[PDB]
Design goal:
Chain lengths: 90, 91
C-alpha cells in the first residue's frame, strides 16, 4: 500500500479565480473519487481526503492538500508445474 | 494618496499652515506644517493583501512640545479610521 500526501497550488492574478478553480478541483476530486494513473488504465488512485487551507501561501505552501493511496500486488512470476510424474512401490 | 491625506489634514485642522511633500519646504515656511512620507508596500497575507505604510511628520516652531501633542491628537483624530477620498486619483 502506497500512500502519498500531494499538495496542490493554484496561482492566478485574480483571487476569485483561485477560489473558483480550487472549488471545482475539489468537487471533481470528490465526485470522481479516483484518478486514472495512466491512459492504459490497469491502475487507479483512490482519494482519501481533500482539504483546502485558503490562508496558506500561494507559492511556497499551496492551498489544496489531497491524500491518495493505491494498492499494488507483488508480481511473482516464478516457474510452473508443467510436467508432473510419480512412481510406486509397496 | 498624498493628495487625499494632505487635503484631509488641511481641511480639518486649522492650526496647520500647510502640508507638503518630503523635501519641498524651505527655511521660510510658516510653522506648524506637516509632511506626508510614504513607506513600504509589504505583502501581509490573503486577508490584508498589500499593506502600505504612511507617516505624517508634524513640525512646530520650538515654542513647546505641548503644541505638538495637541496637534498630534488632532491629526490622529482626523485620519484614524476615517475614509478619505482622493479627488486626484478618484479612489
Amino acid at each position: 500500500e502506497i500512500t502519498k500526501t500531494m499538495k496542490c497550488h493554484v496561482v492566478s492574478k485574480n483571487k476569485d479565480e483561485i477560489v473558483k478553480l480550487l472549488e471545482t478541483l475539489e468537487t471533481s476530486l470528490i465526485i470522481d473519487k479516483r484518478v486514472r494513473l495512466r491512459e492504459d488504465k490497469n491502475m487507479y488512485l483512490t482519494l482519501v481526503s481533500v482539504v483546502e487551507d485558503r490562508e496558506s501561501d500561494m507559492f511556497t505552501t499551496g492551498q489544496l492538500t489531497a491524500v491518495f493511496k493505491m494498492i499494488g500486488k507483488i508480481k511473482r512470476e516464478g516457474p510452473t508445474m508443467d510436467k508432473i510424474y510419480g512412481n510406486g512401490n509397496l | 494618496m498624498r493628495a487625499g491625506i494632505r487635503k484631509a489634514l488641511i481641511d480639518n485642522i486649522k492650526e496647520l499652515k500647510g502640508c507638503y511633500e518630503p523635501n519641498v519646504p524651505n527655511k521660510d515656511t510658516k510653522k506648524p506644517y506637516m509632511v506626508v512620507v510614504q513607506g513600504q508596500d509589504n505583502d501581509h497575507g490573503e486577508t490584508i493583501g498589500f499593506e502600505r505604510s504612511i507617516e505624517v511628520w508634524i513640525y512646530e516652531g520650538r515654542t513647546t512640545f505641548k503644541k505638538l501633542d495637541k496637534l498630534t491628537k488632532q491629526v490622529v483624530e482626523v485620519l484614524d479610521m476615517n475614509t478619505i477620498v482622493d479627488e486626484s486619483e478618484n479612489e
